[PDB]
Design a protein around this nucleic acid. Structure first.
Ligand SMILES: [Mg+2]
Ligand SMILES: [Mg+2]
Ligand SMILES: [Mg+2]
Ligand SMILES: [Mg+2]
Ligand SMILES: [Mg+2]
Ligand SMILES: [Mg+2]
Ligand SMILES: [Mg+2]
Ligand SMILES: [Mg+2]
Ligand SMILES: [Mg+2]
Ligand SMILES: [Mg+2]
Ligand SMILES: [Mg+2]
Ligand SMILES: [Mg+2]
Lengths: 120, 99, 132, 194, 102, 138, 101
RNA sequence: GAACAAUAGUAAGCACAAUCAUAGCACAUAAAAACGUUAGGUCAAGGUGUAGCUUAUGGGUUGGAAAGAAAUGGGCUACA
């Protein structure tokens, strides 16, 4: 409602005053978000979409749409191990890589059949 | 080297998340390809040169608005004015060679 | 002959500041650094960003306060807030000085996405250290 | 019209409290500092320059807001936030038997707009194997499972996890690694008998 | 039976800063914090005190005017926490053709 | 004489959660000059003694990084200019810390940290045992 | 403007490399392995050759920020050996001082 | 422009020296070394006064920038 904001700005005008101390300056800037949250933590403001270690380390659940005994598993276990040890990529970002691999392998069907090894 | 030690190492790699089956060093490169960020995605690489256009445009706009005073550009303008008054200015595009 | 950051001696009538009168080999011996930050430590990073920000601040402030600046600025970087200390000749009225400082405190903050403090010390004239 | 106002020095009281004028970090304005301090290399026939217009005094960080009186006054108010350390763990000998797990966590602070530091994700786990319920076979299997991560001179197992992006995720992964290493050391498979 | 675990105390992010501020009271011979501490900039009368603050606020508003009029010169963000208070504000509506959304 | 009254208005609550326990807290402050580090160490120990922390202080060895550049602009390699970067370290050791005590100490420590120095904080978090290792059988 | 046309080209090369970073990584993952059959590796080589020239990270040149000098630059400061000296001799860089030992 | 048992010399200042750094002194090293000479090197670190280009001496893409008849400077390997 516009009237709620109209009544809130009147309150804000009365509460707002010129700063008398640097302590008040720092308090106001911290409440606004300019000042760092002390004690400083290098992970403040970043939550990685609320994921945990099992969304990063364990990626074998995304390898179901691949041949289990073929060389595709041997190739993809290395990329999953790399993504698990990669801290610079997110869980959703790794999903893009594995889905791109799924799409590419399922698109290039003639070559995998001509290679002599059965693949799905 | 024994089968017991091989099984122990294979299980240790599985529990630590390393590569389970034996693989060659040349094929191990794909592991490092994903374990670390690529060079083109590094912040020290893709953010090497600051956007000089932003700085130049902001400074010129401030100078025209009347907040920043650029001595170098003022000197350039004074020299250009003096050269044009002397008689050697900037030729118009399309007539320098033909006309 | 070394010529870096070295003002040549005239006949004995030019005024020089304390920073100008000391050669660059006297840095950390007789005079300190004009800027302080953690980027130039051993195990730290992000030094080029701090250097380019510092040089942009120098060039911006030189045009912001033309002719009234006494000496080089002091750029202190302390916990995400950047303090800029300057010595200015009392040539401009305080009405214009407050306008300029209020303009800068917001422009630099919004340009560098960090809080800034600006402090000015008014001097009647440039302080002379050696022969004048 | 030019005006020259005298500084606060003529108005500063001798017994007036200092932290009131310097509550936080300040750029050391000479007008509010009643102490005549000369800084700089003196001339052969001269003296070091006074505090007025001295860039040397402005370059250095001033500790006028951290005088001992101000520190005591601040800590008197901060005494209300802290909790009392239990006396039951005065010596590390009891701390080892009560809390055998040690978690080393790194924190860094640097001046600048950015906060992310790649070394913040590192979490180290230290567990003394003399405080666990491992049997002989379980201990012998676990030593070979961990390999070089466990030393014999000190008998402390160390876990160095850096795979997770977040520090909390790394801590949870270290706890999971400790759990699985303890659990799988008791399982005897068919290839152990050979 | 012997291990004693104390309880934790949870406080606001600025509660400790307010506790720090409570220790220091107002100074007698000191000008208000908003004005510059340099004597040449210290106001002398009430009209001068009002005028200096008005001039500073006018400069702040002029800077904000440039920031709003040229958003593209401040779109690049360097601070990791991504503070929105310092981002330029847009006066143009997003949708013009749709009457309901306009 | 004009002292304001009732200036202390804190908001402190005691949560039912057990407080975090810390074994050893190492603070390594690195800087360029030694006077700043000495003053900072004096301030830190004076603050810690009032709170009763029994702080231990020692100075790790410094590290000097030197490099060499050309002295002239176009062609002069026989003459060089060598630049030096000194890094001095001060180590403060705290023992027998609690979650709130460490927080309140780091509040008064970091807020007054000098601009020319940086700080690395290492915490030895104390835990008894995880829930799945108390007395499990597979 | 920028410092030089060479710098204006280099920033475009860096932008293109950033844009094509993931695709090149995915393609190279198919070339730097021996598990996959060699039939698809040639197709992957053709695909990576079909990519734009300025997409590979080998074309980037670490020039100076201020003067765009192709050589004599320091990676830590991204500045040439001359601009670095000019800034350091004025005391504008913290912790930097003449080496005397 | 000088006679120390003194005969027109006082002299700010820049140099030299001292100090600083190689974490204790001393030594050594490092650093520093003015005013000027070589119209010494650098319009190609960067900007520049003057004189010249503007459907080009400007801006982009691809492909090539060999080779040694021969002489010489500085280094590595040795000729045990
Ligand atoms: Mg150019
Ligand atoms: Mg003389
Ligand atoms: Mg000595
Ligand atoms: Mg000597
Ligand atoms: Mg020498
Ligand atoms: Mg000497
Ligand atoms: Mg010549
Ligand atoms: Mg020549
Ligand atoms: Mg040129
Ligand atoms: Mg030429
Ligand atoms: Mg030859
Ligand atoms: Mg040679």
């Amino acid at each position: 409602s516009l009237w709620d904001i109209e009544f809130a700005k009147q309150l804000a005008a009365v509460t707002e005053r010129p700063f008398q101390n640097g302590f008040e300056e720092m308090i106001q800037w911290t409440k606004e978000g300019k000042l760092w949250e002390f004690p400083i933590n290098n992970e403040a403001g970043f939550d990685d979409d609320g994921s945990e270690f099992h969304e990063h380390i364990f990626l074998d659940k995304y390898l179901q749409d691949f041949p289990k005994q073929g060389p595709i598993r041997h190739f993809m276990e290395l990329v999953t191990c790399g993504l698990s040890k990669n801290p610079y990529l997110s869980v959703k970002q790794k999903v893009e890589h594995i889905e791109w691999f799924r799409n590419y392998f399922n698109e290039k069907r003639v070559i995998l059949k001509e290679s002599g090894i059965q693949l799905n | 080297l024994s089968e017991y030690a091989v099984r122990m190492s294979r299980l240790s790699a599985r529990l630590f998340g390393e590569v389970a089956r034996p693989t060659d060093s040349k094929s191990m490169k794909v592991v490092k390809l994903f374990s670390e960020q690529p060079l083109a995605k590094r912040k020290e690489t893709y953010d090497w040169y600051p956007n000089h256009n932003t700085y130049f445009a902001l400074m010129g706009t401030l100078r025209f608005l009347g907040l920043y005073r650029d001595e170098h550009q003022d000197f350039r303008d004074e020299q250009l004015r003096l050269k044009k008054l002397r008689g050697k200015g900037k030729p118009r595009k399309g007539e320098g060679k033909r006309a | 002959k070394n010529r870096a950051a070295r003002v040549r001696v005239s006949k004995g009538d030019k005024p020089v500041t304390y920073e100008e009168a000391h050669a660059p080999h006297y840095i950390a011996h007789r005079k300190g650094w004009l800027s302080l930050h953690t980027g130039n430590l051993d195990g730290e990073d992000h030094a080029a960003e701090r250097t380019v920000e510092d040089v942009f601040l120098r060039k911006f402030m030189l045009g912001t306060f033309p002719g009234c600046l006494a000496d080089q600025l002091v750029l202190k970087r302390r916990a995400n807030q950047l303090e800029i200390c300057a010595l200015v000749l009392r040539q401009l009225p305080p009405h214009k000085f407050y306008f300029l400082v209020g303009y800068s405190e917001t422009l630099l903050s919004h340009f560098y996405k960090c809080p800034v403090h600006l402090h000015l010390q008014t001097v009647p004239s440039k302080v002379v250290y050696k022969y004048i | 019209r030019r005006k020259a106002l005298p500084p606060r020095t003529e108005k500063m009281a001798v017994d007036q409290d200092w932290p009131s004028v310097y509550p936080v970090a300040a750029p050391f304005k000479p007008s509010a500092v009643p102490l005549p301090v000369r800084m700089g290399y003196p001339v052969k026939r001269g003296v070091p320059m006074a505090k007025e217009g001295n860039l040397e005094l402005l370059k250095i960080p001033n500790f006028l807001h951290l005088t001992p009186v101000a520190i005591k006054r601040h800590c008197e108010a901060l005494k209300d936030f802290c909790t009392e350390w239990p006396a039951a763990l005065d010596s590390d000998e009891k701390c080892e038997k009560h809390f055998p797990i040690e978690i080393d966590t790194a924190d860094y602070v640097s001046a600048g707009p950015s906060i992310r530091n790649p070394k913040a994700r590192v979490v180290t786990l230290r567990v003394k194997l003399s405080s666990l319920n491992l049997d002989d076979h379980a201990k012998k299997k676990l030593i070979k499972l961990v390999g070089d991560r466990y030393c014999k001179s000190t008998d402390v197992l160390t876990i160095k996890t850096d795979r997770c992006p977040l520090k909390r995720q790394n801590y949870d992964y270290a706890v999971y690694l400790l759990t699985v290493l303890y659990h799988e050391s008791w399982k005897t498979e068919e290839w152990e008998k050979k | 039976e012997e291990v004693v675990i104390p309880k934790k105390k949870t406080w606001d992010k600025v509660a400790i800063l307010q506790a720090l501020a409570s220790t220091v009271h107002r100074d007698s011979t000191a000008a208000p914090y908003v004005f510059q501490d340099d004597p040449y900039l210290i106001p002398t009368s009430s009209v001068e005190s009002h005028s200096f603050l008005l001039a500073k606020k006018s400069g702040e508003n002029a800077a904000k005017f440039i920031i709003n009029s040229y958003p593209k010169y401040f779109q690049k963000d360097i601070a990791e926490p991504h503070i929105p208070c310092l981002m330029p504000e847009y006066f143009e509506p997003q949708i013009e053709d749709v009457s309901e959304a306009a | 004489v004009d002292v304001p009254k009732d200036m202390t208005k804190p908001e402190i609550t005691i949560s039912d959660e057990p407080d975090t326990l810390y074994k050893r807290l190492s603070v390594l402050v690195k800087g360029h000059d030694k006077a700043v580090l000495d003053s900072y160490e004096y301030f830190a120990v004076l603050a810690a003694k009032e709170l009763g922390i029994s702080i231990k202080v020692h100075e790790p060895p410094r590290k000097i990084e030197r490099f060499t550049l050309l002295k002239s602009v176009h062609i002069f390699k026989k003459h060089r200019v060598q630049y030096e970067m000194r890094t001095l370290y001060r180590c403060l050791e705290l023992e027998h810390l609690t979650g709130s005590t460490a927080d309140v100490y780091l509040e008064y420590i970091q807020r007054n940290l000098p601009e020319g120095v940086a700080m690395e904080v290492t915490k030895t978090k104390l835990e008894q045992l995880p829930e799945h290792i108390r007395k499990p059988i597979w | 403007y920028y410092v030089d046309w060479k710098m204006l080209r280099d920033v475009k090369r860096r932008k293109m490399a950033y844009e094509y970073a993931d695709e090149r990584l995915r393609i190279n993952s198919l070339r730097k392995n021996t598990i996959l059959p060699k039939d698809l590796q040639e197709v992957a080589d053709e695909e990576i050759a079909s990519l734009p020239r300025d997409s590979c990270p080998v074309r980037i040149r670490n020039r100076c920020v201020m003067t765009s000098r192709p050589r004599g630059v320091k990676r830590r400061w991204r500045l040439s050996r001359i601009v670095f000296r000019h800034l350091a001799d004025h005391g504008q860089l913290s912790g930097v001082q003449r080496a005397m030992w």
